[PDB]
Amino acid sequence: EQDCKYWPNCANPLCAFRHPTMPPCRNGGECKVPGCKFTHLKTPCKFRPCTNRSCPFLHEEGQRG
Amino acid sequence: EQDCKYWPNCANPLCAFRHPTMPPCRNGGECKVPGCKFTHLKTPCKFRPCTNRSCPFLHEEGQR
RNA sequence: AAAA
RNA sequence: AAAA
Ligand SMILES: [Mg+2]
Ligand SMILES: [Mg+2]
Ligand SMILES: [Mg+2]
Ligand SMILES: [Mg+2]
Ligand SMILES: [Zn+2]
Ligand SMILES: [Zn+2]
Ligand SMILES: [Zn+2]
Ligand SMILES: [Zn+2]
Ligand SMILES: [Zn+2]
Ligand SMILES: [Zn+2]
């Protein structure tokens, strides 16, 4: 099985590539909420600053705007 | 299991051949960076010259 | 076939 | 449901 490279933005409802079971965490990859089992991305967010407050990508300290 | 001939350009989601865990090295198969453990492709690059500064395929001194 |  |  190969990972879908488009997830969490895959537009093919019949995509045969691997999608994580759990939806992406809307707190971002840097989510520190205890017990949160949503999928936390490891891919860094490309926006500087990022102003999407439901961005699932991984942010550094100060990257949020 | 044998290696995938098509990786990193394998479009078969059910591909049985093994795909390396590490992504291809952005420096190309000719990478000389010490300690670099990204996957260094062996198959040569067709583009003469390559224009992709992140082509993972193997180049030569006069393929810039 | 998700605009480099 | 296709990353500003
Ligand atoms: Mg694109
Ligand atoms: Mg197109
Ligand atoms: Mg868009
Ligand atoms: Mg886009
Ligand atoms: Zn997909
Ligand atoms: Zn979370
Ligand atoms: Zn972001
Ligand atoms: Zn393959
Ligand atoms: Zn390398
Ligand atoms: Zn090349």
Numbering used by the authors:
A (entry chain A): 402 to 466
B (entry chain B): 402 to 465
Show me the paper's own sentences about this structure.
The essential heterogeneous nuclear ribonuclearprotein, Nab2 (nuclear abundant poly(A) RNA binding protein 2), a conserved polyadenosine RNA-binding Zn finger protein, functions in polyadenylation, surveillance and the generation of export-competent mRNPs. The S. cerevisiae Nab2 protein contains four domains: an N-terminal PWI-like domain that interacts with NPCs followed by a Gln-rich linker; then an Arg-Gly (RGG) domain required for nuclear import; and finally a domain containing seven tandem CCCH Zn fingers that binds polyadenosine-RNA in vitro, contributes to poly(A) tail length control and is also a checkpoint for proper 3′ processing. The Zn finger domain is essential for Nab2 function and for its binding to poly(A) mRNA, albeit only fingers 5–7 are necessary and sufficient for high-affinity polyadenosine-RNA binding. Here we describe the crystal structure of a complex between polyadenosine RNA and Chaetomium thermophilum Nab2 Zn fingers 3–5 that are homologous to S. cerevisiae fingers 5–7.
